[PDB]
Amino acid sequence: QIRYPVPEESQEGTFVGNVAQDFLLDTESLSARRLQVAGEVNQRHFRVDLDSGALLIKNPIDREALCGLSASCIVPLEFVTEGPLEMYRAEVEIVDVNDHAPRFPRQQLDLEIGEAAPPGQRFPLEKAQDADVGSNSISSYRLSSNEHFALDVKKRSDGSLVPELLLEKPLDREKQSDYRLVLTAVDGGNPPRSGTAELRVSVLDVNDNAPAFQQSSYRISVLESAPAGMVLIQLNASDPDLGPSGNVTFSFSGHTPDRVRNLFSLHPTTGKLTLQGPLDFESENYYEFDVRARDGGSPAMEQHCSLRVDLLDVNDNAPHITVTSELGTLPESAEPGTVVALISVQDPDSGSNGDVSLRIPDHLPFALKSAFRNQFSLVTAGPLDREARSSYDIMVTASDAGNPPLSTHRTIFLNIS
Amino acid sequence: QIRYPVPEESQEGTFVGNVAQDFLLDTESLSARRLQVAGEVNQRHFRVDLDSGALLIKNPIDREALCGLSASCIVPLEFVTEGPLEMYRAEVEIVDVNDHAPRFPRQQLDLEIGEAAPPGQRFPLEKAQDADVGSNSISSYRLSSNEHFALDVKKRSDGSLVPELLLEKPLDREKQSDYRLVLTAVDGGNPPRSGTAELRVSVLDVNDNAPAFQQSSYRISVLESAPAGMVLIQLNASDPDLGPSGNVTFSFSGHTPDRVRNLFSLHPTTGKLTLQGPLDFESENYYEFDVRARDGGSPAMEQHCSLRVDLLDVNDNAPHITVTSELGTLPESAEPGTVVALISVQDPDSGSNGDVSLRIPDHLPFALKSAFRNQFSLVTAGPLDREARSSYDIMVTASDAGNPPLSTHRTIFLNIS
Ligand SMILES: *[C@@H]1O[C@H](CO[C@@H]2O[C@@H](C)[C@@H](O)[C@@H](O)[C@@H]2O)[C@@H](O[C@@H]2O[C@H](CO)[C@@H](O)[C@H](O[C@@H]3O[C@H](CO)[C@@H](O)[C@H](O)[C@@H]3O)[C@H]2NC(C)=O)[C@H](O)[C@H]1NC(C)=O
Ligand SMILES: *[C@@H]1O[C@H](CO[C@@H]2O[C@@H](C)[C@@H](O)[C@@H](O)[C@@H]2O)[C@@H](O[C@@H]2O[C@H](CO)[C@@H](O)[C@H](O[C@@H]3O[C@H](CO)[C@@H](O)[C@H](O)[C@@H]3O)[C@H]2NC(C)=O)[C@H](O)[C@H]1NC(C)=O
Ligand SMILES: *[C@@H]1O[C@H](CO[C@@H]2O[C@@H](C)[C@@H](O)[C@@H](O)[C@@H]2O)[C@@H](O[C@@H]2O[C@H](CO)[C@@H](O)[C@H](O)[C@H]2NC(C)=O)[C@H](O)[C@H]1NC(C)=O
Ligand SMILES: *[C@@H]1O[C@H](CO[C@@H]2O[C@@H](C)[C@@H](O)[C@@H](O)[C@@H]2O)[C@@H](O[C@@H]2O[C@H](CO)[C@@H](O)[C@H](O)[C@H]2NC(C)=O)[C@H](O)[C@H]1NC(C)=O
Ligand SMILES: *[C@H]1O[C@H](CO)[C@@H](O)[C@H](O)[C@@H]1O
Ligand SMILES: *[C@H]1O[C@H](CO)[C@@H](O)[C@H](O)[C@@H]1O
Ligand SMILES: *[C@H]1O[C@H](CO)[C@@H](O)[C@H](O)[C@@H]1O
Ligand SMILES: *[C@H]1O[C@H](CO)[C@@H](O)[C@H](O)[C@@H]1O
Ligand SMILES: [Ca+2]
Ligand SMILES: [Ca+2]
Ligand SMILES: [Ca+2]
Ligand SMILES: [Ca+2]
Ligand SMILES: [Ca+2]
Ligand SMILES: [Ca+2]
Ligand SMILES: [Ca+2]
Ligand SMILES: [Ca+2]
Ligand SMILES: [Ca+2]
Ligand SMILES: [Ca+2]
Ligand SMILES: [Ca+2]
Ligand SMILES: [Ca+2]
Ligand SMILES: [Ca+2]
Ligand SMILES: [Ca+2]
Ligand SMILES: [Ca+2]
Ligand SMILES: [Ca+2]
Ligand SMILES: [Ca+2]
Ligand SMILES: [Ca+2]
């Protein structure tokens, strides 16, 4: 048929075509025939010049508002004359111009993705809008360089592009929690027009880290004389997760025997291990037990650590003197060398702290004899006369080889008859 | 020195040794010398027979209560005589018997392990107790066959065994949530004695599964006449996690345009997509949008699904008759063939539903002429005489080719002069 191209957004009065000449109307009859555009809308947008017979633009036309996403926009125009009454038809092709840039409906997009999202999961993106059609519509999407995310641009049945964010590699909030990316959409105009949007993705924390001790195990030496309330060690553990999932508390293992809990206490927040009671190298020389650090996650991650506390001997025991047997009363006629008492000594300490020596004052008529290790018998070493002295109080003194030495004193009472 | 072996837990009166004969004491002097055990404890456990001079057990001896975990248990015994007063020493070796079976302090142990525990993490176990020493103490640990856990048995500085549970492969509560294992501890006695304990481990859930749609995408066809409240589709998605982490809810994507939300609604629990308003094939022929299923986990996992709804044309529009120009009044002298009116018809439906035919009753002196598609002019087809009839009401009827057809009626009023 008769087709006139005219670009959209053309100014008022732009020449479309000589409709009178294409309808073969006589020039001299323009004022009588009263050629008019039919249709209220087309009379709003088109008019016929009465003098030349040319079809002119009255009000500028928006192709986007007229045809939307249709590929071709052709507007059939109807014309009317009188005398005689006649109708004519012609087609105006409205040509699209590139007066729309791609534009994201939101220029700021925010995503919250869980740290444990599986690779391959997809996330929708808002496509930019370009009201044009054909080569002037959106032609490509671009995603800035990053290491975990890529673009998966989808082609719809009509030719629309749909960008999707594809997680390619697993995330880790503990290494990087925020990503700032730019998404760009470009049309195929000349020159190409484009628009961008900032996509801020934050990684939500999963409790995927257990607490970590500074060392795998600790070994401690402490003197058995250490006072109650002494800090033996401060355990340090870190947990990189966020919030309560990064909150560390310390405790004894659940199966920790009572003999350990009675002597040691562990501060739940600071991890300071303190001493709660008396230690004794003589009964127990070392303790090994496990402690644990738990985070406040759901479910909780825990890590255990092995502790060994070695005790150091202190010279805290003086010798103990036991008089096994005692004559008590003795006749003055007894010959020198008579065994008067049996004495055993013991010292629970080790090394020089437990080596016992025994002594009595010299001026007495008695002597100490030893036939077995740490065993002494007290015997008569001189003559005895009841009339001179009727009774003896013999002071025996035991000493260990500690520094300073510890001494024990015991008196054996002996009557003479 | 003088050493006598005697087994622990020996009955009263068991022969240890002839101490008198080893101390070279005369048999005839037993009642006078009054050989006695020294020490209250040893007098509780040992006695000397006055007639034979043999050292005998008074009360049975527990080696475990005496030496604990020491490798060697040797008890120095002291003896005393009178007339003259003398002291002797000898050593009794108490030999351990295998009168203790390994026994776990708890025979039921329960562990709660997070599903996302990393392989290589270790978990303490309560070691069994065997009060014996040497080869009679605990000699081995065994863990029943399973696929995720193994045993890491530790050797302490003193020779104690510490069993630890080692996670070798990652867990998955969604495949198996409970493990029943038996831990066995065996000593090295003849015969070996052993004891077992049941360890029930439960796997605590992590929200590591997103909801899964039945299909990756759905495509729906619906007639534009479908009534409001019609269910177009029921979306089904499953989530295998536990509790709220397995609770699925449905929604439109956050970026879903308002033109979609106005026409369709999605039940958050059931996933039924219903129709909320009028559809119109003539203005919009299809809709594509994304819906998402989110679980109630922290953080939430989500999965999207693409929906496309195609509309089907219904013959819901009758033709529209527009009378472009109308003479209104006509002289009776006008020749036949005079164009009286200009008529244009349009039907927005497609195919046969939008093909228009036009007609008027036959007996009238008028006719319909068509020079362009869907355009008709009403012209005079016979002679006219005002005196016969002074005015005409001409009923024009348009019909589409639908089943059933839709009709439009319009009357043009024409005066004759
Ligand atoms: C557990 O941690 C505490 C605290 O350590 C703190 O964090 C670490 C990472 C470092 O930055 C450290 O400087 C911080 O205080 C440890 O306590 C500290 O341990 C130091 C040994 O590396 C120790 O030197 C320091 O005490 C000082 O020592 C100086 C002599 O070297 C003295 O002149 C001074 O007066 C202090 O007495 C100590 N500080 C405190 C406040 O405790 C602790 O050792 C860690 N535990 C384990 C088992 O490693
Ligand atoms: C979403 O799920 C529903 C419900 O499905 C239920 O779970 C699945 C795993 C099956 O066990 C199913 O039997 C359960 O009802 C689906 O609804 C059902 O879909 C069936 C198609 O597979 C459909 O046949 C059924 O309707 C019946 O159809 C029969 C004729 O084949 C009729 O004779 C009968 O009267 C029903 O009209 C329907 N049932 C219900 C209660 O809806 C639904 O299709 C799924 N959606 C998608 C998109 O797959
Ligand atoms: C980190 O946690 C501590 C301790 O939490 C306790 O142990 C948890 C495993 C769980 O059992 C909680 O219910 C316990 O509260 C928090 O310290 C507490 O702070 C409050 C004051 O706000 C105080 O009244 C409590 O007594 C404290 N708990 C203890 C055991 O002393 C601490 O607030 C947490 N850290 C942060 C940053 O919130
Ligand atoms: C599964 O969840 C539903 C819905 O939970 C809602 O959506 C969540 C994502 C979150 O926003 C919640 O705060 C919402 O409640 C539960 O259904 C609810 O049940 C209560 C009665 O107990 C009812 O009053 C609410 O209205 C319901 N919610 C809706 C949206 O209708 C349901 O109980 C959960 N399943 C289980 C097994 O607990
Ligand atoms: C968007 O991208 C286009 C081409 O990629 C540029 O021409 C424009 O300046 C904007 O950066
Ligand atoms: C893409 O980048 C431009 C700046 O070049 C912004 O204007 C836009 O908002 C988006 O960040
Ligand atoms: C424990 O194990 C020992 C040897 O392994 C057995 O002898 C005993 O019967 C029990 O099963
Ligand atoms: C090991 O197995 C035995 C049964 O043979 C139980 O007695 C014990 O409690 C543990 O289950
Ligand atoms: Ca425009
Ligand atoms: Ca345009
Ligand atoms: Ca454009
Ligand atoms: Ca991590
Ligand atoms: Ca943590
Ligand atoms: Ca984390
Ligand atoms: Ca002591
Ligand atoms: Ca000591
Ligand atoms: Ca001492
Ligand atoms: Ca015993
Ligand atoms: Ca035993
Ligand atoms: Ca045993
Ligand atoms: Ca899993
Ligand atoms: Ca889930
Ligand atoms: Ca799970
Ligand atoms: Ca319609
Ligand atoms: Ca229709
Ligand atoms: Ca129709």
Short mmCIF file of N, CA, C and O in Angstrom, two decimals, chain A residues 122-186:
data_model
loop_
_atom_site.label_atom_id
_atom_site.label_comp_id
_atom_site.label_asym_id
_atom_site.label_seq_id
_atom_site.Cartn_x
_atom_site.Cartn_y
_atom_site.Cartn_z
N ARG A 122 21.48 -20.21 41.83
CA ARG A 122 21.25 -19.03 41.03
C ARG A 122 20.40 -18.01 41.79
O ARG A 122 19.57 -18.38 42.62
N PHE A 123 20.63 -16.73 41.49
CA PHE A 123 19.93 -15.64 42.15
C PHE A 123 19.42 -14.67 41.10
O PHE A 123 20.19 -14.24 40.22
N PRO A 124 18.14 -14.32 41.13
CA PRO A 124 17.58 -13.42 40.11
C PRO A 124 18.15 -12.02 40.23
O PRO A 124 18.50 -11.55 41.31
N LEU A 125 18.22 -11.34 39.09
CA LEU A 125 18.60 -9.94 39.02
C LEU A 125 17.54 -9.14 38.29
O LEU A 125 16.88 -9.64 37.37
N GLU A 126 17.36 -7.88 38.70
CA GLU A 126 16.40 -7.02 38.01
C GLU A 126 16.97 -6.60 36.67
O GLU A 126 18.06 -6.02 36.61
N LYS A 127 16.25 -6.90 35.60
CA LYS A 127 16.80 -6.57 34.30
C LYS A 127 16.58 -5.08 34.10
O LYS A 127 15.62 -4.50 34.62
N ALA A 128 17.47 -4.46 33.34
CA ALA A 128 17.25 -3.06 33.04
C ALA A 128 16.13 -2.93 32.03
O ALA A 128 15.77 -3.89 31.34
N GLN A 129 15.57 -1.73 31.94
CA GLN A 129 14.47 -1.48 31.03
C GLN A 129 14.94 -0.56 29.92
O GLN A 129 15.60 0.46 30.17
N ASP A 130 14.58 -0.92 28.70
CA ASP A 130 14.86 -0.12 27.51
C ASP A 130 13.61 -0.23 26.67
O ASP A 130 13.36 -1.27 26.05
N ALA A 131 12.82 0.85 26.64
CA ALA A 131 11.51 0.81 26.02
C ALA A 131 11.58 0.67 24.51
O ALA A 131 10.55 0.43 23.87
N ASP A 132 12.76 0.80 23.92
CA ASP A 132 12.90 0.64 22.49
C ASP A 132 12.79 -0.84 22.11
O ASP A 132 12.71 -1.73 22.96
N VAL A 133 12.79 -1.09 20.80
CA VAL A 133 12.68 -2.44 20.26
C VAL A 133 13.78 -2.64 19.22
O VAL A 133 14.48 -1.70 18.84
N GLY A 134 13.91 -3.88 18.76
CA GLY A 134 14.90 -4.18 17.74
C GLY A 134 16.31 -4.00 18.27
O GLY A 134 16.62 -4.32 19.42
N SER A 135 17.19 -3.48 17.41
CA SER A 135 18.58 -3.25 17.80
C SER A 135 18.72 -2.17 18.86
O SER A 135 19.77 -2.11 19.52
N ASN A 136 17.71 -1.33 19.05
CA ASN A 136 17.75 -0.27 20.06
C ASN A 136 17.39 -0.73 21.46
O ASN A 136 17.54 0.04 22.41
N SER A 137 16.91 -1.96 21.62
CA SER A 137 16.60 -2.51 22.93
C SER A 137 17.88 -3.04 23.58
O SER A 137 18.97 -2.95 23.02
N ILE A 138 17.74 -3.57 24.80
CA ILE A 138 18.92 -4.03 25.53
C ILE A 138 19.59 -5.14 24.73
O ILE A 138 18.94 -6.09 24.27
N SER A 139 20.90 -5.01 24.55
CA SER A 139 21.68 -5.94 23.76
C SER A 139 22.68 -6.75 24.56
O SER A 139 23.05 -7.85 24.13
N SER A 140 23.13 -6.26 25.72
CA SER A 140 24.08 -7.07 26.46
C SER A 140 24.13 -6.67 27.93
O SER A 140 23.85 -5.52 28.29
N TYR A 141 24.49 -7.65 28.76
CA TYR A 141 24.76 -7.44 30.17
C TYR A 141 26.22 -7.75 30.48
O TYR A 141 26.82 -8.64 29.87
N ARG A 142 26.79 -7.01 31.43
CA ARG A 142 28.17 -7.23 31.86
C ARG A 142 28.23 -7.22 33.38
O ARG A 142 27.55 -6.41 34.03
N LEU A 143 29.06 -8.08 33.96
CA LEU A 143 29.25 -8.11 35.40
C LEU A 143 30.72 -7.86 35.67
O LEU A 143 31.59 -8.47 35.03
N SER A 144 31.02 -6.96 36.60
CA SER A 144 32.40 -6.66 36.90
C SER A 144 33.16 -7.90 37.38
O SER A 144 32.57 -8.90 37.82
N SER A 145 34.48 -7.84 37.24
CA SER A 145 35.35 -8.94 37.62
C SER A 145 35.18 -9.25 39.11
O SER A 145 35.21 -8.35 39.95
N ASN A 146 35.01 -10.53 39.43
CA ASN A 146 35.02 -10.97 40.82
C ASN A 146 35.36 -12.45 40.78
O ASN A 146 35.32 -13.05 39.72
N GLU A 147 35.43 -13.08 41.94
CA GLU A 147 35.97 -14.44 41.97
C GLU A 147 34.97 -15.53 42.31
O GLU A 147 35.27 -16.70 42.08
N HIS A 148 33.81 -15.19 42.85
CA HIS A 148 32.85 -16.20 43.25
C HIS A 148 31.61 -16.22 42.37
O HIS A 148 30.95 -17.26 42.29
N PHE A 149 31.30 -15.11 41.71
CA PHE A 149 30.05 -14.93 40.98
C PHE A 149 30.32 -14.73 39.49
O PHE A 149 31.33 -14.13 39.10
N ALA A 150 29.42 -15.26 38.67
CA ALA A 150 29.45 -15.03 37.23
C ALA A 150 28.04 -14.73 36.74
O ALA A 150 27.07 -14.84 37.49
N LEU A 151 27.94 -14.34 35.48
CA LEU A 151 26.65 -14.02 34.88
C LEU A 151 26.15 -15.17 34.03
O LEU A 151 26.91 -15.79 33.28
N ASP A 152 24.85 -15.43 34.15
CA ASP A 152 24.13 -16.38 33.33
C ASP A 152 22.98 -15.59 32.73
O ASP A 152 21.99 -15.30 33.41
N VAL A 153 23.13 -15.16 31.48
CA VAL A 153 22.17 -14.27 30.86
C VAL A 153 21.26 -15.18 30.06
O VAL A 153 21.72 -15.92 29.19
N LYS A 154 19.96 -15.06 30.29
CA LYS A 154 18.96 -15.90 29.65
C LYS A 154 18.22 -15.18 28.55
O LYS A 154 17.95 -13.98 28.64
N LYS A 155 17.92 -15.92 27.49
CA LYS A 155 17.26 -15.43 26.30
C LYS A 155 15.85 -15.98 26.36
O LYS A 155 15.66 -17.20 26.37
N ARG A 156 14.88 -15.09 26.38
CA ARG A 156 13.48 -15.47 26.47
C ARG A 156 12.93 -15.69 25.07
O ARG A 156 13.60 -15.45 24.07
N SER A 157 11.69 -16.18 25.02
CA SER A 157 11.17 -16.64 23.74
C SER A 157 11.02 -15.46 22.79
O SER A 157 11.12 -15.63 21.57
N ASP A 158 10.77 -14.27 23.34
CA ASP A 158 10.60 -13.05 22.57
C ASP A 158 11.90 -12.30 22.31
O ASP A 158 11.89 -11.32 21.56
N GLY A 159 13.01 -12.71 22.92
CA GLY A 159 14.27 -12.02 22.74
C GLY A 159 14.69 -11.12 23.88
O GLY A 159 15.67 -10.38 23.73
N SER A 160 13.98 -11.15 25.01
CA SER A 160 14.37 -10.36 26.17
C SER A 160 15.51 -11.03 26.91
O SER A 160 15.56 -12.26 27.01
N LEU A 161 16.45 -10.23 27.41
CA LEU A 161 17.56 -10.76 28.19
C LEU A 161 17.22 -10.67 29.67
O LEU A 161 16.76 -9.64 30.16
N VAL A 162 17.48 -11.77 30.38
CA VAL A 162 17.30 -11.90 31.83
C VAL A 162 18.61 -12.23 32.53
O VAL A 162 19.09 -13.37 32.41
N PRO A 163 19.25 -11.31 33.23
CA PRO A 163 20.54 -11.64 33.83
C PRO A 163 20.33 -12.35 35.16
O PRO A 163 19.44 -12.00 35.94
N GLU A 164 21.15 -13.36 35.43
CA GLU A 164 21.09 -14.09 36.69
C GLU A 164 22.50 -14.20 37.25
O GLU A 164 23.47 -14.37 36.50
N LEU A 165 22.60 -14.09 38.57
CA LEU A 165 23.87 -14.24 39.25
C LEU A 165 24.08 -15.70 39.62
O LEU A 165 23.22 -16.31 40.26
N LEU A 166 25.22 -16.25 39.22
CA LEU A 166 25.50 -17.66 39.44
C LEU A 166 26.68 -17.77 40.38
O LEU A 166 27.75 -17.22 40.10
N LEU A 167 26.48 -18.45 41.50
CA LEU A 167 27.57 -18.69 42.43
C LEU A 167 28.41 -19.84 41.87
O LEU A 167 27.92 -20.96 41.74
N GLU A 168 29.67 -19.56 41.56
CA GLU A 168 30.55 -20.57 40.98
C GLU A 168 31.44 -21.24 42.01
O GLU A 168 31.69 -22.44 41.91
N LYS A 169 31.93 -20.49 43.00
CA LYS A 169 32.79 -21.02 44.03
C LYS A 169 32.20 -20.76 45.41
O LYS A 169 31.52 -19.75 45.62
N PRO A 170 32.43 -21.66 46.37
CA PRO A 170 31.87 -21.48 47.71
C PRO A 170 32.36 -20.19 48.36
O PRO A 170 33.49 -19.74 48.13
N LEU A 171 31.50 -19.61 49.17
CA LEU A 171 31.81 -18.38 49.88
C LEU A 171 32.40 -18.68 51.25
O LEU A 171 32.30 -19.79 51.77
N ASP A 172 33.01 -17.65 51.84
CA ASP A 172 33.55 -17.76 53.19
C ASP A 172 33.58 -16.35 53.79
O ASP A 172 34.45 -15.54 53.45
N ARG A 173 32.62 -16.08 54.68
CA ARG A 173 32.54 -14.77 55.31
C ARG A 173 33.80 -14.48 56.11
O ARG A 173 34.19 -13.32 56.27
N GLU A 174 34.45 -15.53 56.63
CA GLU A 174 35.66 -15.36 57.42
C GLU A 174 36.83 -14.85 56.59
O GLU A 174 37.81 -14.36 57.16
N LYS A 175 36.76 -14.94 55.26
CA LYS A 175 37.79 -14.38 54.39
C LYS A 175 37.38 -13.06 53.76
O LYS A 175 38.21 -12.15 53.64
N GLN A 176 36.13 -12.94 53.34
CA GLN A 176 35.61 -11.70 52.75
C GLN A 176 34.11 -11.69 52.96
O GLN A 176 33.42 -12.61 52.50
N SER A 177 33.60 -10.66 53.63
CA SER A 177 32.18 -10.62 53.97
C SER A 177 31.34 -9.77 53.02
O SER A 177 30.13 -9.99 52.94
N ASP A 178 31.94 -8.84 52.28
CA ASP A 178 31.18 -7.95 51.43
C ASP A 178 31.76 -7.92 50.02
O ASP A 178 32.98 -7.92 49.85
N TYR A 179 30.88 -7.90 49.02
CA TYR A 179 31.27 -7.74 47.63
C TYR A 179 30.50 -6.58 47.01
O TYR A 179 29.27 -6.52 47.11
N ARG A 180 31.24 -5.68 46.37
CA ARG A 180 30.69 -4.53 45.65
C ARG A 180 30.90 -4.79 44.17
O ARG A 180 32.05 -4.82 43.70
N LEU A 181 29.82 -4.99 43.42
CA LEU A 181 29.93 -5.29 42.00
C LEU A 181 29.09 -4.28 41.23
O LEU A 181 28.13 -3.72 41.76
N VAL A 182 29.46 -4.03 39.98
CA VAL A 182 28.66 -3.21 39.08
C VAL A 182 28.11 -4.06 37.94
O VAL A 182 28.85 -4.84 37.33
N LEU A 183 26.82 -3.92 37.69
CA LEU A 183 26.14 -4.62 36.61
C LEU A 183 25.82 -3.57 35.55
O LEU A 183 25.28 -2.51 35.87
N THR A 184 26.16 -3.87 34.30
CA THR A 184 26.00 -2.90 33.23
C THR A 184 25.10 -3.49 32.16
O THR A 184 25.23 -4.66 31.81
N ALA A 185 24.17 -2.68 31.65
CA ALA A 185 23.32 -3.08 30.55
C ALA A 185 23.49 -2.09 29.42
O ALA A 185 23.41 -0.87 29.63
N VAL A 186 23.72 -2.60 28.21
CA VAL A 186 24.02 -1.78 27.05
C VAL A 186 23.06 -2.16 25.93
O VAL A 186 22.78 -3.35 25.73
#
